[model samples]
Target: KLEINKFNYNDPIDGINVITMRPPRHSDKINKGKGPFKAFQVIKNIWIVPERYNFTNNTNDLNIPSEPIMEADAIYNPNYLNTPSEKDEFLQGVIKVLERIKSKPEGEKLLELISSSIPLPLVSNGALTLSDNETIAYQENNNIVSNLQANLVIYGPGPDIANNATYGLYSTPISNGEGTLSEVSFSPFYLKPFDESYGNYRSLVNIVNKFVKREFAPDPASTLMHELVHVTHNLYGISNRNFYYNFDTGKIETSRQQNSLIFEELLTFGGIDSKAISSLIIKKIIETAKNNYTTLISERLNTVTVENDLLKYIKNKIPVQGRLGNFKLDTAEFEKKLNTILFVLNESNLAQRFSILVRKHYLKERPIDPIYVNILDDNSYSTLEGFNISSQGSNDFQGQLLESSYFEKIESN
Candidate 1:
């Protein structure tokens, strides 16, 4: 005791401490933002791929896979939503929903399994652009357009990324203002600067919530799912929007069209439920899967499509609590909702191959982040924007899982 000496720690990282970085300016910002520095950013968790979807709390396994979970399964983290309150309620709800959806009869299903799938894909097939590089690109140009266009620039170096470069979704001015929605197809990424040191990404939703009123939940999942679908479709060549035709106008138009298509698709496929999906997790996956995008998207699509098909079959074949909001829906209501969904899927461009890309990209991206968070916006939320928009952000990309000792996970062993 007499020999004990204390050392002051300026930079201290405890054994188990979660660091939430909400940009430098938003010191008091309670939620996510949208401008230059306002745009969403990725904070790669040190925990390997296993931690992402294990559901179990053991974090000792260092052997994590590179690819994200494509089926959109819940990880059931003990620290759900970074808190303990209502954890059991949320988990129970998710488990019940999953089991009910998956256990439907083969002949009938509530959630129709689309020939399409989930797990938003990445840029070029094998690379990722680091945030560092994107920053430089914006600095050189000093223009919001250049910054916004930075998503098209692909690079890599991380495990999931190429090796030395990484793809980047640079920040841009939030021109659409607040309470609006946007999507990007060419790069399939969105960015916002730290607005005039205000810590906003230029989104009106946050502004209204903080300043005007907190009526809406500014659900990030809606944007996440929509943009993800757009990018995934574009990456896989499913959506023939042709974003690279011209970086400024054509690309912008394509992005706008994609936004519309995705918005409609989400309305039918999954409404804006504040309980599902995370824009952050979606962003992380796309950023990480740079060069390996093609393979990743395809694999993710196959798996998610199968799972979604199984769920659809179960819900239609069995009588269970309808988490999809048809709770006790009479025969008439059920028929109507089903018909609406079919109509949207059939009539919209989102029903095509590219929509499959978006689903696959998102499914592979955030396997462990709570399923409720992933799927909540699927069936409940509405688009906040009024025009064209784009997708952006990073993911848990792992590279060459083929060479890793844990390669078995990638396969259906």
Candidate 2:
């Protein structure tokens, strides 16, 4: 097993190369083929920064004092960020113009409107201090992981201070030189709010609600959790293609069962949010089987056609593939899976009701078997697999509600 060293971003030994830290943490980590991008990859979730260097060690090279060096973290201003700065004097003149505009009733009210519209914590103060490792240690020990406290530092030609030191504004160090006037500003990739946006976007039942919501969904409390699972399974140099759902039917191509299994396994194994588990575009997987057994059999491998012209878009619906891989999702798959799941609770809905039955009886009620321990120690990449509809010999799925109704029933608790 790899040494049990805690993952550290600050250590120069690991994530320190300037190129690696360019977009910083989230942008660098999230785009590793897990979900954000499939064909062309983009690291979307984690942030990275320069290595924490002990300038005291190499003063001669730095040609500076023995005091500890202050590293600059870019402070990002979301609002007015796109607004460009003219010449310094011209910029000041523009500010004066804006002030004069605001001086009128419309201007002052506009300023208040802008301020109030900012929502409490959106406007960032442009300074941060990381005095030493001890400071970080104490903070880490006391603080909670889920709600982390962070400081954003701003850098500009104006009076924005960084790391609490008087390094000239808009200045950061490059390998070959110093004082390059290179900006130390937060890229969108490194911003925490952006990562939160991923989870927020995924949780939206409607696409418009994603950017429209003022706050994130109450469920899926950990925005980082879903991305972490993706990273663990996809990147990290683990799990070959055998672990994925790739199947071909003689003339037709589909992966309904494979997609169901992948989706279920992610949530069941990882304890991810329930909202993440339910996909309208796919069928629900009812059973779990050993990797070898499931791979041997593939179920629901047939297809059908609709005779109607305008309604001819209707066809046999298989499930979906988790990523944009072999399972090319068309209209048939969407309607089949989405409408089927929505039909649950109705007596006529036989498809998803089967999975619900399995969850209640075999899967949820049964204790995880102690024998399952050996299944984990094997450490093979693709040996551990998710459900595929083709597996058999599993006919043996041999299987919370709070409510109050008063007065009408003349009942008492």
Candidate 3:
């Protein structure tokens, strides 16, 4: 028969449960000097030691400090961030720009435009803060995950007062943590609104918009707005869906997507009033597009030439062991040639793919801008069937009216 005793005591050392035997030994003398083993308890869920234990005399005393030990934590104190650094300046600029956008009539007006355009509600009730990952973090009050606060981060560079020059702007989105929040990082660029650099054709979007004679000169404000449009597309999950519909067979290609967005930008800005400055912007955009097209063609040609060269190099130099008897080549040289061939091939393929897609989608088969007109047949100016402007507007307008009527009816009851 095995003897066992249950006790609600914990090990002094590691806080593990220490199980004692049925008959516990009582200790009278102070636990000093060396003593023979007095079996205490067996550790549950662990191997039992066959040998006995002993205690030795403690000649040296433990030098435990009287004061409690201190430790450091990674959680940063906001107070420590008082001194302004590069990050601080960037953050200040971002806030300043946001404040400008939030200013009086213009800011509210812009927000209204955005809200009306997007299907989802804009959750602006959040604390805005900067993250180490060069992102702006927005924490919502309540979120789906654990009813915990959700975050929406937006990152980008702000205006540099010292430089007086604007930086090119580009943006992309990434999601984080339980898919509850998103992070958008824009290329670090100074937004110089009133600076003389605005007059120069430095920023492509501004120049394009200016060339087209848009009422307002395309500035940092407009660039930010454009990026916000992209943000909306991502949030609504329409960025991908928006492209495939423009093609036949329900299949979409890269160029179609790119062209759609490019044209969409054009359409979005089309509402602006025209001017000499705006004309310059539009001309620049068109010129840029032309240049892009030419580059694609030239690159495609170069890629093909490189691919041909690669094929020749492979046939002439890289031969199988048995195929070319005693015709050995330097292994190092062969590897270099092989790497060059691969690089050339990769470049060529990418260029060709881009060229083909752009030419096919934008130049040859230009899809109708849904904002103004409907899809049309090849070589015909006539709009496709079931695409009347009146019907399209009426359908959406009527739907809104019906919704309003339904709500009114419900309230009356």
Give each model a TM-score. 0.19, 0.17, 0.25
Compute the lDDT for candidate 3.
Answer: 0.24
Off by over 4 Å in 2: 1-216, 219-221, 239-254, 257-413
* Each model's lDDT: 0.23, 0.20, 0.24
lDDT by residue (46-126, candidate 1, tens digit) is 110001111111211213343563233212123322232332232332322223222323101212221122113222222
Give the Å shift of residue 362 in candidate 1.
17
Sort the predicted structures by TM-score, highest score first: 3, 1, 2
Quote the lDDT for 78 in model 1: 30
Candidate order (lDDT) = 3, 1, 2
* Candidate 2: 10-residue stretch with minimal lDDT: 398-407
Candidate 2, 316-345: lDDT as tens digits: 212333321122334354444333222221
Off by over 4 Å in 1: 1-216, 219-247, 251-413
Q: Report the error of model 2 at residue 339, Å.
A: 35
Deviation (Å) of 243 in candidate 2: 6.0
lDDT of 2 at 16: 19
Best candidate according to lDDT: 3
Better of 1 and 3 by TM-score: 3
In model 3, the Cα lDDT at residue 235 comes to 30
